[PDB]
Design a protein around this ligand. Sequence first.
Ligand code: NIO
Ligand code: NIO
Ligand code: CL
Ligand code: CL
Ligand code: CL
Ligand code: CL
Ligand code: CL
Lengths: 297, 294
Amino acid sequence: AEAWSPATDERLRAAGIDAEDARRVVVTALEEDLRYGADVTSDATVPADAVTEAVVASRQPGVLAGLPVALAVLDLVTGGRFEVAECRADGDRLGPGDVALRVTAATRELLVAERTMLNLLCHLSGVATLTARWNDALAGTHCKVRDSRKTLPGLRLLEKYAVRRGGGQNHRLGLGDAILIKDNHIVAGGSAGAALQAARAHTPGLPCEVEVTTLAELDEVLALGADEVMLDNFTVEQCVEAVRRRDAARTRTRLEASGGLTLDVAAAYARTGVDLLAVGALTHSAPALDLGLDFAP
Amino acid sequence: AWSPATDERLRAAGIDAEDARRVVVTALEEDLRYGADVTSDATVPADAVTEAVVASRQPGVLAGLPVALAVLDLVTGGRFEVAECRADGDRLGPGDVALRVTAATRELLVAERTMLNLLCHLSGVATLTARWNDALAGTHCKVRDSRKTLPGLRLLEKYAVRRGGGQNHRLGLGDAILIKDNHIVAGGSAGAALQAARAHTPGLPCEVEVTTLAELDEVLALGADEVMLDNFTVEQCVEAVRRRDAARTRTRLEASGGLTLDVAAAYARTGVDLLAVGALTHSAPALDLGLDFA
Ligand SMILES: O=C(O)c1cccnc1
Ligand SMILES: O=C(O)c1cccnc1
Ligand SMILES: [Cl-]
Ligand SMILES: [Cl-]
Ligand SMILES: [Cl-]
Ligand SMILES: [Cl-]
Ligand SMILES: [Cl-]
């Protein structure tokens, strides 16, 4: 059914969801489910007549994300013919049994939207839930957790959204909106400093970060007064040493740790005094949150 | 569009090329909508050319290699050359080289994150399916996936389930009948729903999903073609298998409902025929693979 109402767009923008990218994910998702034909089960067992109330509820505890996008799915499928009794907001915690949403619509259109709505909800909520677990291992300290570009193909802007709902911070969104000098770059550049100066000269407008793999390279970029340094696969002892040299430099470089991080060692790392943790697992190994859709009897 | 040799390698693997194009193109647009690769354009010579290796830091099953190459084909307009490759479904160990390519250095640095996000997710899915298959070894029980896939990735994820030694369930709402709890709520009774579905399209096999041992007996009485056990315990599966063997029918039993790997080997020894596991596709940890230069 084409595209959705302007009301849905205002709801998506109000949430900080890129509405154009959300349309592309939603329409793609429904095509995967409907390209083999109409819902053969529902059309045989459910009158084209019925309307039900339906409850989206969690079977386990975590953080909710994706509710405006799931309602966009339903808006598209029902052509706006639905009504909402109750909803939670993305960011809210849910225990088992809690109701994220209660809606009423045509029973057949609910059966068509269900799996698409829940796949989004369960994945985005899984990302927000894991992000919150990391952010909680960082209480007591001033450390913050960040995502990366290790997102799933097609879902980057929505996974970034879900990390924010979990209390995390986004890193850059693509290759052209920020400079991040990695190892392949420092190879061809000759040193880390040459690469840092090359990027600053070539694109002085952009934010800039350099990823280092040794304390020596860390010394180069500190001398050049790098705004931000990423410590690739440092042990907790090495981070303490990195933080000492940073504190003794003329420039206050923000330090981010990346590579070799797990939820347990997270508090040990945060304790060294690094400012940021960059965790790929937030968006590429986030277990889904178990949410389900039930019809009112 | 990519070279037609790439279309052929995809068809030879069992991958839908149209859908793989949409995934690859969409994934590239995500990384490139903000501008060219500023970092590489500042630090990497435009004429540079390099050999790169994809290798796994972890053991698992490889899947997605024909798609990763399609990404490289697109980004390079065909100007690359493969020296070595494993096949999807091969077991990798720490250090194993899945692929060795030569291409323009800047084109490898643009492609690599899209290539690896595909490779690591699909191999993650294939690796987890293989673990389920190991826990089911010594049984006639097989593992199946579901429609709990990540949006846009269904066909590629179903492919990686097959590469990991598992079976595909139906692909969408229209290719098979599956009578769920909400069809029963919206429709009185589980046996009534089964009979309605049989009436409507007699040649289509009806799988019906039950939540109690009572419901099980009622559809077993109607000679149910195939039955899905929703959230039965291991001990209720054993009872269900007994009631099925006692009933006169050759009804196939499939268990599903929160199945986790640590109880997988137990569930396989109740005598059910299939386990439908959503975790294969919605909770598969990514397999750690990297792209390293010469
Ligand atoms: O954008 C990236 O490449 C990135 C961000 C955080 C950590 N590692 C990589
Ligand atoms: O295709 C489905 O809807 C399905 C298949 C198995 C288990 N759960 C859902
Ligand atoms: Cl925000
Ligand atoms: Cl469903
Ligand atoms: Cl700077
Ligand atoms: Cl196959
Ligand atoms: Cl990268």
